[PDB]
Amino acid sequence: SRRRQTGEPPLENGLIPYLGCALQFGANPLEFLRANQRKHGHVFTCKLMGKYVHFITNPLSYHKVLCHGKYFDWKKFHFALSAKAFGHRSIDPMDGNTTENINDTFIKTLQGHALNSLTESMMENLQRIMRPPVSSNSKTAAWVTEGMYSFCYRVMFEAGYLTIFGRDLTRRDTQKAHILNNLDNFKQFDKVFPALVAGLPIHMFRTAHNAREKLAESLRHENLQKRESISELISLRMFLNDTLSTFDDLEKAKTHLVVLWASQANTIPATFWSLFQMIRNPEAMKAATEEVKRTLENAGQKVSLEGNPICLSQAELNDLPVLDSIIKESLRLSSASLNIRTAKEDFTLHLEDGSYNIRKDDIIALYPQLMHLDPEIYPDPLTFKYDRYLDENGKTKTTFYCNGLKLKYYYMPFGSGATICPGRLFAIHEIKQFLILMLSYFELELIAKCPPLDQSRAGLGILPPLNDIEFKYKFKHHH
Amino acid sequence: SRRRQTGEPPLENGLIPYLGCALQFGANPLEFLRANQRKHGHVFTCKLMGKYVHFITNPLSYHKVLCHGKYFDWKKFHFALSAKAFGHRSIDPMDGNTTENINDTFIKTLQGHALNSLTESMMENLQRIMRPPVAAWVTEGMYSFCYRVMFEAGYLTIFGRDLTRRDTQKAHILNNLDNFKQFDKVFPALVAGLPIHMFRTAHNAREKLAESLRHENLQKRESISELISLRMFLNDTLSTFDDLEKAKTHLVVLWASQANTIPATFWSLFQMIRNPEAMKAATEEVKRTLENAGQKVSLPICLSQAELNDLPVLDSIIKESLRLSSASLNIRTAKEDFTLHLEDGSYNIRKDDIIALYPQLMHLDPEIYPDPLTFKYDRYLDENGKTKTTFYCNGLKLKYYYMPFGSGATICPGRLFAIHEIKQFLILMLSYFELELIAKCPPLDQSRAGLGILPPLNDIEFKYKFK
Ligand code: HEM
Ligand code: HEM
Ligand SMILES: CC(C)CCC[C@@H](C)[C@H]1CC[C@H]2[C@@H]3C(=O)C=C4C[C@@H](O)CC[C@]4(C)[C@H]3CC[C@]12C
Ligand SMILES: CC(C)CCC[C@@H](C)[C@H]1CC[C@H]2[C@@H]3C(=O)C=C4C[C@@H](O)CC[C@]4(C)[C@H]3CC[C@]12C
Numbered sequence: 045s046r047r048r049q050t051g052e053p054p055l056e057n058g059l060i061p062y063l064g065c066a067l068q069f070g071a072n073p074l075e076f077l078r079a080n081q082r083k084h085g086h087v088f089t090c091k092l093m094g095k096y097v098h099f100i101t102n103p104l105s106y107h108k109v110l111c112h113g114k115y116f117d118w119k120k121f122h123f124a125l126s127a128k129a130f131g132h133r134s135i136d137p138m139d140g141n142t143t144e145n146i147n148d149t150f151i152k153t154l155q156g157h158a159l160n161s162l163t164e165s166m167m168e169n170l171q172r173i174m175r176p177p178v179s180s181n182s183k184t185a186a187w188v189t190e191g192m193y194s195f196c197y198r199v200m201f202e203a204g205y206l207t208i209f210g211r212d213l214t215r216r217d218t219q220k221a222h223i224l225n226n227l228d229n230f231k232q233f234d235k236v237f238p239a240l241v242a243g244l245p246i247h248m249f250r251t252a253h254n255a256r257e258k259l260a261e262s263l264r265h266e267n268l269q270k271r272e273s274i275s276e277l278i279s280l281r282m283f284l285n286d287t288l289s290t291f292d293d294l295e296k297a298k299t300h301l302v303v304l305w306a307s308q309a310n311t312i313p314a315t316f317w318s319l320f321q322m323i324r325n326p327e328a329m330k331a332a333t334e335e336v337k338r339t340l341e342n343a344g345q346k347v348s349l350e351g352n353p354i355c356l357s358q359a360e361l362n363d364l365p366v367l368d369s370i371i372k373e374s375l376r377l378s379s380a381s382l383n384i385r386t387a388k389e390d391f392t393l394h395l396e397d398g399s400y401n402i403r404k405d406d407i408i409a410l411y412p413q414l415m416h417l418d419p420e421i422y423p424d425p426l427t428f429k430y431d432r433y434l435d436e437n438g439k440t441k442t443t444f445y446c447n448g449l450k451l452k453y454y455y456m457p458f459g460s461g462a463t464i465c466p467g468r469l470f471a472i473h474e475i476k477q478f479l480i481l482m483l484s485y486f487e488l489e490l491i492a493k494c495p496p497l498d499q500s501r502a503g504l505g506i507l508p509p510l511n512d513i514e515f516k517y518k519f520k521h522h523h
Numbered sequence: 524s525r526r527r528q529t530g531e532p533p534l535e536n537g538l539i540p541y542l543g544c545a546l547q548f549g550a551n552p553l554e555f556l557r558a559n560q561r562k563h564g565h566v567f568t569c570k571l572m573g574k575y576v577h578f579i580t581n582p583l584s585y586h587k588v589l590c591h592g593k594y595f596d597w598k599k600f601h602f603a604l605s606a607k608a609f610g611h612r613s614i615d616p617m618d619g620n621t622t623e624n625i626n627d628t629f630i631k632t633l634q635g636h637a638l639n640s641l642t643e644s645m646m647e648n649l650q651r652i653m654r655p656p657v658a659a660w661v662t663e664g665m666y667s668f669c670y671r672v673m674f675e676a677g678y679l680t681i682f683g684r685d686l687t688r689r690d691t692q693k694a695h696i697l698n699n700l701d702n703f704k705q706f707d708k709v710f711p712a713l714v715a716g717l718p719i720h721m722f723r724t725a726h727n728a729r730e731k732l733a734e735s736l737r738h739e740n741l742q743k744r745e746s747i748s749e750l751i752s753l754r755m756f757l758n759d760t761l762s763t764f765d766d767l768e769k770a771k772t773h774l775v776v777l778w779a780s781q782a783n784t785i786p787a788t789f790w791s792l793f794q795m796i797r798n799p800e801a802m803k804a805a806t807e808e809v810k811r812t813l814e815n816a817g818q819k820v821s822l823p824i825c826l827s828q829a830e831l832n833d834l835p836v837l838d839s840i841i842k843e844s845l846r847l848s849s850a851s852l853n854i855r856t857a858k859e860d861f862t863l864h865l866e867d868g869s870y871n872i873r874k875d876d877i878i879a880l881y882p883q884l885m886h887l888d889p890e891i892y893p894d895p896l897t898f899k900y901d902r903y904l905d906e907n908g909k910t911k912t913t914f915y916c917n918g919l920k921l922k923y924y925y926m927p928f929g930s931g932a933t934i935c936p937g938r939l940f941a942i943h944e945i946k947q948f949l950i951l952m953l954s955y956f957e958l959e960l961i962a963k964c965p966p967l968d969q970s971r972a973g974l975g976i977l978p979p980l981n982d983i984e985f986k987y988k989f990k
Binding site for chain 1: 535536537538539540544545546547548549550555558573708709711712715716717718719720721722723724725970
């Protein structure tokens with residue numbers, strides 16, 4: 045059994061399978077980490093996910109781990125997690141199944157030119173999905189009540205699925221069927237994801253296991269080749285699977301399920317929280333409505349449920365500081381990411397207050413929700429302030445302080461440094477696009493107090509609400 | 524990682540913290556083990572509770588692990604579990620903090636003469652609690668009712684009574700009860716190796732319980748069980764435990780005496796009232812025994828040891844209740860690498876591996892117990908109305924067919940006392956109250972899979988009125 049040696053952080057006893065475990069027995073991961081801070085100070089070690097994880101919780105020390113460092117491996121743990129949760133052989137190029145640099149693939153196809161086409165495609169897809177079936181106005185005249193999470197889930201999943209994996213236009217009559225099946229199968233697989241990253245076998249979850257494998261079946265190359273308007277990301281990944289890997293057909297299908305998960309698992313809860321917080325807070329709703337109305341006015345874009353679609357420029361979509369602030373403030377409150385790297389050798393990590401001996405293969409982790417909810421940095425941290433990331437000029441605020449010192453890293457739901465989401469710009473675009481179309485197509489009302497976060501997914505990104513909340517919507521801008 | 528070697532059972536990949544985990548993600552421990560049985564056959568290995576656990580699921584092979592064997596250590600895992608969950612240094616005499624043989628201590632003080640005085644004391648304590656204060660219906664949750672009655676009675680029987688301040692004892696009892704609920708709630712997690720400081724309320728509850736069981740506080744009490752009196756003595760003369768650790772050893776015994784008894788009592792009561800035929804048979808049996816014993820009920824019943832034991836209808840109701848609700852893990856640890864020879868196969872076992880039975884698989888086997896999910900109150904009654912002991916698997920008569928208390932060396936030392944206390948409770952319920960449900964049968968809560976008698980996922984309400 046492991047014993048603390050001199051210079052190593054305080055070592056907590058106990059085995060924690062995963063961060064969101066045991067909520068039914070009264071666990072609370074945020075409060076658990078905060079209790080460890082009070083007990084041990086800003087650095088402490090836990091046995092978590094079968095590793096020894098050093099938590100660095102001083103915001104002033106984040107820069108020392110988020111920089112590139114000779115002793116940091118920022119891919120090892122993620123590679124192992126993917127192989128384990130999705131079921132494929134090692135994608136670590138050291139293990140010889142592939143020579144692809146996947147970071148390079150993502151950056152090339154989610155940023156730059158590729159981001160522009162993705163963004164246009166998402167906007168077309170969102171409009172096809174959110175617009176009512178071309179029929180009488182009486183069909184869409186009344187208020188409709190639905191769970192908001194459930195609504196966001198189906199719109200964003202379908203739009204995101206078709207944007208990333210293209211569309212099958214050979215059989216249009218059955219695509220509602222296939223999408224609903226894919227949607228249901230993804231819900232069932234993602235449900236058990238916290239357990240899978242803990243090392244629990246997917247065999248323990250029969251329906252989830254079946255769902256994962258049916259999803260993989262739909263993403264076999266033979267099936268993707270039937271589709272049109274496929275993202276450059278998946279086109280390239282198909283090509284690099286074929287030319288740079290020795291993966292079998294199923295494993296190639298699994299690599300696309302990985303990307304499906306990556307594109308959906310955070311975006312869906314992010315969209316929910318942004319919509320909810322916007323509707324819940326009258327000032328936010330008012331500010332967002334005016335910003336979007338003005339942008340569409342200035343861009344000469346008419347809103348209609350049928351006919352001409354909205355086409356915004358890349359600058360018009362990016363220069364939406366009120367929507368940006370609403371999204372950032374929604375993620376500040378809901379984000380529960382683990383930012384990780386693995387010690388390449390024994391070394392001493394030099395931080396703000398102290399220096400700490402780290403062993404080879406130990407994990408050095410940040411849990412930035414601790415910073416996001418820190419009242420020293422964000423006064424009234426549990427309050428949604430739609431303008432929290434707006435300065436006096438109504439532009440995006442970038443000045444935040446801890447102990448009077450200006451923070452470089454103050455907002456981290458996408459990570460930072462090398463450990464950062466390559467899809468972040470596309471994510472912000474798709475949420476903005478969703479919000480724009482919601483404000484433009486619908487009148488919107490709640491029926492609802494703010495649900496707590498579901499911490500069973502602690503470490504996996506944006507936390508969903510513990511329970512859905514009902515809202516009502518009604519189409520506007522009819523003929 | 525571990526690789527399955529030649530001759531070893533099929534090895535399931537993955538890591539299972541504890542058997543009742545991940546229910547919120549759709550896990551089902553019983554169906555998981557059954558699925559593995561279909562997939563792999565009667566023997567398979569899982570990484571469970573940080574060990575490599577070989578499940579032996581053939582009822583015809585149980586006898587080969589329930590015998591004393593050169594390679595079976597049947598104490599190591601339990602010792603390690605107690606230290607972890609309750610917080611004390613090793614009680615393994617090999618580790619040098621005690622020379623007590625705790626198994627001997629329990630047998631000496633829970634069986635024989637000691638059993639007779641425990642049983643007499645439990646009846647007095649139950650009657651003290653259940654009697655009317657010195658004509659309305661009361662509606663209550665049945666589990667909640669069984670909990671408070673059996674906890675109080677069992678606590679006072681095992682740990683005695685503080686008679687110096689009678690005026691505050693209901694307050695002290697209610698605090699102990701609340702604290703025990705909060706501690707026991709997280710028990711499944713603790714046996715997985717999760718730290719108790721992950722559960723602030725439960726941690727505080729465990730230590731407040733320990734505080735009340737310090738020797739200084741036990742010495743204030745009277746009519747203490749011989750079990751706790753001897754345990755106190757052996758703490759002092761045979762161990763080098765500190766005061767807190769000595770208190771924790773008594774908390775261990777409090778848990779042992781309560782955590783299975785309470786759910787057992789709920790199920791026996793619930794199944795008896797729910798099933799008219801069972802209620803009629805139990806009522807007639809108790810009536811006849813009390814009449815033949817010259818015992819009249821009123822606002823002290825003194826049954827002989829023979830009179831309490833010879834209650835086959837009540838015995839059958841309790842057995843059939845535990846057959847349905849029991850989720851025990853019967854465990855031993857391999858002392859060395861060896862080949863285990865079972866009915867159909869031989870399997871290589873590594874030193875420090877666990878060899879496990881999960882008897883719920885047998886209890887709910889339709890080959891052994893036809894219509895296994897139906898409560899049949901007379902399932903353990905033969906044609907003569909005596910306790911039935913003849914059960915078959917593939918036509919072969921089973922030695923081990925009813926295992927909620929374990930079997931062999933790995934058997935609950937309090938089992939006889941346990942059956943007495945549930946019988947006494949049922950006797951008093953039938954004798955003192957009119958009883959009505961307000962209720963379809965709750966499913967079992969499998970979060971406690973491995974820990975004994977599973978409670979219902981939800982309580983059910985019932986009414987009771989003093990006769
Ligand atoms: C609100 C939406 C999203 C949030 C909060 C989010 C958050 C994250 C976080 C925290 C990581 C891990 C960063 C690290 O510590 O290394 C990550 C990785 C990743 N994300 Fe996102 N993400 C979002 C949307 C998307 C979208 C729409 C895509 C579309 C393809 C995407 C693709 C990825 C990929 C491919 C990785 C792994 C990169 C690698 O391992 O090289 N994400 N995301
Ligand atoms: C329905 C009631 C009860 C059930 C179902 C039950 C069940 C069990 C089971 C399955 C074991 C583990 C046996 C093994 O596999 O090694 C056990 C151990 C034990 N039980 Fe019980 N029990 C019950 C009542 C009691 C009561 C009332 C006491 C009172 C003191 C008690 C004291 C113990 C002790 C001390 C051990 C550990 C023995 C040792 O480690 O040497 N039990 N029980
Ligand atoms: C098969 C290959 C072509 C692709 C492999 C890419 C794998 C390694 C990438 C793709 C998406 C990535 C996850 C992600 O999107 C978000 C988070 C949130 C953060 O809090 C914890 C890490 C986590 C779960 C990432 C883990 C690594 C993943 C699975
Ligand atoms: C401190 C010492 C004086 C006493 C130590 C005794 C410890 C080792 C004894 C006392 C009570 C025993 C538990 C028990 O009652 C019932 C079960 C159910 C079974 O399904 C799994 C094992 C389990 C949890 C036993 C584990 C070992 C325990 C804690």
